[PDB]
């Protein structure tokens, strides 16, 4: 359980990713493919690009970054309230596209990567381990519910 300190630290560098939530979205997505390309082949819509210019010049990549981000942004806004908000996300990402508890947790290291890099001022070490623990919150109860619905991630 995080404390209102912990969500207000979440919160605080959140507020900077919505001045640009697309740029983010692609810095991320990018990081995430560049650090564990195997994850590219889960994206029918992206498994051809090759490059970081071709994902940078993706414009189904960019609004991708924008729908992740902004997904995740209502969940963190939920402060730990969000079983409605992850019923249909691990509905779909557990029996659709069929993803592993591990790439979630090779997502979360791109979120934190991309906010370390772009928000010094805002992810500090207090900041980054409350985001830490919210993305840690996060997975815990999504593979939670990968359990009830059939799929071990
Ligand atoms: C913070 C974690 C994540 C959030 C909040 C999130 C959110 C979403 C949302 C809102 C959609 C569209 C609706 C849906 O199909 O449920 C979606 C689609 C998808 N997500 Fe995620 N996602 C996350 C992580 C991941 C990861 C790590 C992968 C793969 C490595 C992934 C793969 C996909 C795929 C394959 C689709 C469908 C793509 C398509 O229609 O072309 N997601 N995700
Ligand atoms: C990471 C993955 C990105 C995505 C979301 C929506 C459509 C395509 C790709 N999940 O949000």
């Known amino acids: 359980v995080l404390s209102e300190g912990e969500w207000q630290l979440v919160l605080h560098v959140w507020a900077k990713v919505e001045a640009d939530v697309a740029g ?3 810095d ?3 990081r995430l493919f560049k650090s564990h390309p195997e994850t590219l082949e ?3 819509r992206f498994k051809h690009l090759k490059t970081e ?6 414009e189904d990549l960019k609004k991708a970054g924008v729908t ?3 997904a995740l942004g209502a969940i963190l806004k939920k402060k730990g309230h969000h ?8 509905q779909s990402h ?9 790439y979630l947790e090779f997502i979360s290291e791109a979120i934190i990567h991309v906010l370390h890099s772009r928000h010094p001022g805002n992810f500090g070490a207090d900041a980054q381990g409350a985001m830490n ?3 840690e919150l996060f997975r815990k109860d999504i593979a939670a519910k990968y359990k009830e619905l059939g799929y071990q991630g």
Do not use: R, W
């Not at 210019?53 to 993706?58: C, G, I, P, Q, R």
């Open 42 to 44: 889960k994206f029918d």
């Open 94 to 102: 557990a029996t659709k596209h069929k993803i592993p508890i591990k």
């Open 24 to 26: 983010h979205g692609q």
């Open 53 to 58: 210019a071709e994902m940078k010049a993706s």
């Open 133 to 135: 623990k919210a993305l």
């Open 68 to 70: 992740v981000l902004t």
């Open 28 to 30: 991320i997505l990018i």
């Open 83 to 90: 079983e409605a908000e992850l019923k249909p996300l691990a």
